[PDB]
């Protein structure tokens, strides 16, 4: 297909509320959610649940880029996740990068969504993440590989929604143009359709 | 250089089964509730015990059942020849704190001082080998000077293995040689170990030897310490009336 | 052994590392059915009798032969090589890791390769009854073996047989006769012998040397036979023709090999030897020498000519590759041929591959590239290749020496006969045919005759071509260089 | 957040089942849980899961200026992280005691035992040497870490391969995994810890305790061993009074346990190499 | 390596140390002189009170985050964070610091606690934040004055204002006390000094000093000279505050 073999697995870990291992190709992320739980008077806010994301790679320590990425994920989830139901409590999303082969965010987002699902957390709509790489010649590639990201001039991670296939998040590396943005966004929408079909298949086989 | 001459002697001039003369004292600092000092050779530890007192910034940690032992470690910069910085906060001083804490929480018999801090503090001024045991023993003398109840002298010392023999109360030289060194701390009256640290490679059948050797060294340390303590108590009582 | 092997391969710089991943990639995937798209420029000889001769237990079989009779009394002979060039196209990493590994080492037990076993025994090789690519050189000849018409064509063939030398000889002259192979082999061995004696009359010299190849219950000595001379003559003819062609077409960049003839200050030892043994020799040229060695026979020493042949091989210089531009020698002492270039075994050499490329572009079935004409880069790779062949020789010698050490360790043989080659003041070099081994023996007051090379002790005298029995004691004092030692008795 | 408290019911039930020599899942006292060793795609990744406790291990390399005292041998950098997914209480910068003790223990065990060859990994004596760091991450927390952390560090450091290097004088040339074949490490012996837990002041002892057994235990004896019966480290924590015969017996146990774990590890590496020599980027071993 | 900032180089030395020249010396001037001062209060918006002071190459901000819940025990507090921008001074220093920033912070706190009256601000901590955009001479004094302006602006109570002044010593054969000097007169100097007082009630609030040398009488003359300088400076700050209050009256 236009994008590569990608699988998932739910309820791996016993201690966290919900967990999900989402791998595509050779990149594999692992997400664990701690549902509505305690929160101190400093971190909390009435009429909303505090969503906190902490992402940590498997090398060195977390610096700044990961903090930016986890802000992106935080706000995306705040966009979809319902929090006016569970005020004065904290939802926590932990992300670990078992492997890194490009298309990282496009994997972390999917894993976060699946974990939130497994934790039975009230969501307004599923979301997904894809990554499209524009080489110099304009030929785009979906769900790229690290080689394709290095040999390319632009890369674009889009976090889309399921209800109306809008654009919840966009993180771009490189420099690109308008028309290319639009066309890669359309291709991302198609890829998101495929990802949603996959989610439904996985959950169908989980409830069986 | 050498560790065990073919005759049986060491560098310092002592056989394997003996140790260096500890010279101690109890009552250094009066602004406290308990203090001690010890020199187990060139080493020079210094202990302090601020007694069972109130918790401030309660922060919901005042155990209601028993007392709260808080022991802090410190190795001065000029202790070793190689100057170092950040004596506190390091990942090793905190391990020493944990060790001392789980020892004295075992010995210090906290069930009688509930909701109270026993603050132990240890500073090592000079280090030439055997840096944990000197501190254990100084803190013991401190506790005792502070009239804090405690099951028994928690006496500590170190042993090692060289040329198919066991050495007692290693120094820095054979501690740098890399050989197996086993530090421990036991309660003599009962024969029970309160702590058993150890770091190097060696066979298993060669374990009982260094183990009993360290134990016997700790017994000797017990004798010396208790003679000191008895002198101290006698002098104090005589002075009272 | 698994330590000494790697140690000698690290000291002689012989690269032993396995093939990197990138290399394996550029190889073809191995569903490999002959693609009829590349077969355009080539032809189809599948309707042909071919019988590749192969020594005991080989896998990088590359050559192939045939001798098809023709209506006109003439017959078409043909040699066939594995057209590795198609697989090994330049600019890759394959080509670089094959250049550095400028030749395939063949130690007494293993073989360090230059191209994977896949491309060496499954694709390029001329395996039996499997259609494989090839380069081909075809001649038309008569029963006196003078060329009449030649051609140098790429093609695809199908080896009907992968024989052994003994199997070859028995298929030839066991009285069996068949339209398939045996007749080809016979009519080809004929031309082989004719060409052989023809070139001997041309002055080219034959030699010998102590060569022992281990299994290791008891070692064995290589045995000569017709089939070997046959295949050798045909392959040499192919090399010479290819060289003449790529020379006439290319006079600036090429790969040739020369054998710089020796200064006459080296033959004097052999001269003095045969003089003290009253056999005259003319060492002025190659012919005189050769036609003389065949006369120096005398019945007292039926095993004599071989000794002079060794004593000669101790003199010849080093044969080296080079480019037609940076030099102008173009003369090969040994074969008495002026031009000669290796063309048969690319699986076993890289200069063979470069020759395949040059010849193919001369035929027009390939495209050029800059590193094929830049004399500088070609000279550099040629120097590398010579250095590497030299390393390989040294390594194989060290290995056979180690195996001899080991065998003498397992079996302590003593007091075996031996002949003499040299005679020096301090030591007396010696040769043992049984084990195919030459060694030294020191004597550390003597009498050293140099006008006539001989040694004199108060009791006896030592001249070349005498006899002595020896006891072989290996000293292992220094585990490094566990060294043999000869003790003498009579 | 905080860990849910422990009820007196569970505590008493556990103590009694110990008195009667009954574990919970159904195993004896001298038994581990099914430990699985799974590998990744990148040389140096290993996920080892004993029962429910999963731990990840990555191994990375660098070239750096060595330290003056040791200009010949290289460097090694351990680190263990307690990911918040391991358990709620593992907030960043809060459970520091556990981090400190685990990291010191692991450093001691592997480094000071001289498990690997810090000399083999020299390139330019005085200017540039290797630097091997190993990051362990705790994913699920059900009971025994030290054993898992150690098995992971070992499987990694035995399933890792360096970028080959050539050298002449001072000219050093690094190369990529696609240009040459990475070179493995140099191990002398693989140590892996073994954890005993004491109940009722020393009367009862268990192996591979779960999380509850860790909440109702008073003492922990860690013992590092090899397949050659070589004590590498031993530690007592929890403020507990043990004796001699106890440590002797625990050591005679750790012997067999480490022998078996080692056999498994070797089998796992064998299977992974076999797979990659057939097409496949994984490797799996089961107790 | 810091994991809260961008990955830069390990070490980085400036180019000046690699220069080759005898830098220019100031020379002569009127020792009892003061640089032209631009002081304005009310610069910043998002802060309850702010002030800005420029004197030569000196350029300092100060903001006051007001009372924030956190007798002699229910007595207010004020914690001051002095901070020089990494782009001030010949050399660059990472933002954290840890050597002189904290010393000058202690100085500011010791010079402000007296003026401010904290009995009327119990159970509260005033966060004073100074920022040095450019160093061109007397810095700690500018910071005291700016913090005073910011406080008086936010409307915290007081007893009097704080005026600072920095002095240096000429290393010539006849050493004279140089008033309100420049970074050049300060790096080519033998001794330095800093006074800070409350001119109405004529009381020092915090001073400081240091010396390649000196002697009692010299230090005393320096002190009194700095006092006179601070007196001569007070009216500028007075007018600045009046002006800001007029602008506020205008806004509403
Ligand atoms: Mg052949």
Curated annotation (Swiss-Prot), chain A:
What GO molecular functions are on record for this protein?
3'-5'-RNA exonuclease activity; DNA binding; RNA binding
Primary location recorded for the protein, binned into one broad class: nucleus
* Domain of life the protein comes from: Eukaryota
Q: Which key words tag this protein in UniProt?
A: Cytoplasm, Disease variant, DNA-binding, Exosome, Intellectual disability, Nucleus, Phosphoprotein, rRNA processing
Query: Which residues span the membrane?
Result: none
- What is one GO cellular-component annotation here? nuclear exosome (RNase complex)
Q: Which CDD domains match?
A: RNase_PH_RRP46
Task: Tell me the GO BP annotations in alphabetical order.
Answer: defense response to virus; DNA deamination; mRNA catabolic process; nuclear mRNA surveillance; poly(A)-dependent snoRNA 3'-end processing; RNA catabolic process; RNA processing; rRNA catabolic process
- This chain's protein is named Exosome complex component RRP46
Q: Record the organism.
A: Homo sapiens
Please name the gene that encodes this protein: EXOSC5
UniProtKB/Swiss-Prot annotation, chain B:
Output the Pfam families linked to this UniProt entry. Answer: RNase_PH (PF01138), RNase_PH_C (PF03725)
Q: Does Kinase appear among the keywords?
A: no
Its localization reads: Cytoplasm; Nucleus, Nucleolus; Nucleus; Nucleus, Nucleoplasm
Q: Name one GO biological process term.
A: RNA processing
Give a GO cellular-component term.
Answer: cytosol
Q: Which domain of life is it from?
A: Eukaryota
Q: Which InterPro entries match?
A: ExoRNase_PH_dom1, ExoRNase_PH_dom2, ExoRNase_PH_dom2_sf, PNPase/RNase_PH_dom_sf, Ribosomal_Su5_D2-typ_SF, RNase_PH
Q: Which GO terms describe its molecular function?
A: 3'-5'-RNA exonuclease activity; mRNA 3'-UTR AU-rich region binding; RNA binding
Give the chief site where it resides.
cytoplasm
Keywords of the record: Acetylation, Cytoplasm, Exosome, Nucleus, RNA-binding, rRNA processing
| Similarity remark | Belongs to the RNase PH family.
Q: How does it assemble?
A: Component of the RNA exosome core complex (Exo-9), composed of EXOSC1, EXOSC2, EXOSC3, EXOSC4, EXOSC5, EXOSC6, EXOSC7, EXOSC8 and EXOSC9; within the complex interacts with EXOSC2, EXOSC7 and EXOSC9. The catalytically inactive RNA exosome core complex (Exo-9) associates with the catalytic subunit EXOSC10/RRP6. Exo-9 may associate with DIS3 to form the nucleolar exosome complex, or DIS3L to form the cytoplasmic exosome complex.
Q: What is this protein called?
A: Exosome complex component RRP41
Q: What is the originating organism of this protein?
A: Homo sapiens (Human)
Source species taxonomy: Eukaryota, Metazoa, Chordata, Craniata, Vertebrata
Curated annotation (Swiss-Prot), chain D:
Region ranges (ARE binding): 1-268
Provide a GO CC annotation, any one: nucleus
For this UniProt entry, the molecular function terms from Gene Ontology, in alphabetical order, are: 3'-5'-RNA exonuclease activity; mRNA 3'-UTR AU-rich region binding; RNA binding; RNA polymerase II-specific DNA-binding transcription factor binding
Q: Where in the cell is it found?
A: Cytoplasm; Nucleus; Nucleus, Nucleolus; Nucleus, Nucleoplasm
Which keywords fit this entry according to its UniProt record? Acetylation, Cytoplasm, Disease variant, Exosome, Isopeptide bond, Neurodegeneration, Nucleus, Phosphoprotein, RNA-binding, rRNA processing, Ubl conjugation
Which branch of life, at top level?
Answer: Eukaryota
Q: Which residues carry this modification: Phosphoserine?
A: 65
Among its keywords, does the record have Lyase? no
Q: Does the keyword Iron-sulfur apply?
A: no
Single GO biological process annotation from the record: nuclear mRNA surveillance
Subunit relationships:
Component of the RNA exosome core complex (Exo-9), composed of EXOSC1, EXOSC2, EXOSC3, EXOSC4, EXOSC5, EXOSC6, EXOSC7, EXOSC8 and EXOSC9; within the complex interacts with EXOSC3, EXOSC4, EXOSC5 and DIS3. The catalytically inactive RNA exosome core complex (Exo-9) associates with the catalytic subunit EXOSC10/RRP6. Exo-9 may associate with DIS3 to form the nucleolar exosome complex, or DIS3L to form the cytoplasmic exosome complex.
Disease per record is: Pontocerebellar hypoplasia 1D: An autosomal recessive neurologic disorder with onset at birth or in infancy, and characterized by progressive axonal motor neuronopathy, severe generalized hypotonia, respiratory insufficiency, and cerebellar atrophy. Death in childhood may occur.
The similarity comment for this entry is:
Belongs to the RNase PH family.
Protein's UniProt name:
Exosome complex component RRP45
- Recite the lineage of the species: Eukaryota, Metazoa, Chordata, Craniata, Vertebrata
**Gene (UniProt):** EXOSC9
From Swiss-Prot, chain E:
In terms of InterPro entries, this protein maps to: ExoRNase_PH_dom1, ExoRNase_PH_dom2_sf, PNPase/RNase_PH_dom_sf, Ribosomal_Su5_D2-typ_SF, RNase_PH
Hydrolase as UniProt keyword? no
List the Gene Ontology MF annotations in alphabetical order. Answer: RNA binding
List the GO terms this entry assigns under cellular component, sorted alphabetically: cytoplasmic exosome (RNase complex); cytosol; exosome (RNase complex); nuclear exosome (RNase complex); nucleolar exosome (RNase complex); nucleolus; nucleoplasm; nucleus
Pfam families linked to this entry = RNase_PH
GO biological process terms, alphabetically, are: DNA deamination; isotype switching; nuclear mRNA surveillance; poly(A)-dependent snoRNA 3'-end processing; positive regulation of isotype switching; RNA catabolic process; RNA processing; rRNA catabolic process
Disulfide-linked positions: none
What keywords would UniProt list here?
A: Cytoplasm, Exosome, Nucleus, RNA-binding, rRNA processing
Is Secreted there in the keyword field? no
- Cellular localisation: Cytoplasm; Nucleus, Nucleolus; Nucleus
PANTHER family assigned: EXOSOME COMPLEX COMPONENT (PTHR11953), EXOSOME COMPLEX COMPONENT MTR3 (PTHR11953:SF2)
Q: Which family does it belong to?
A: Belongs to the RNase PH family.
Q: What's this protein's name?
A: Exosome complex component MTR3
Q: Which organism is it from?
A: Homo sapiens (Human)
Read off the lineage from the record. Eukaryota, Metazoa, Chordata, Craniata, Vertebrata
Q: Gene symbol?
A: EXOSC6
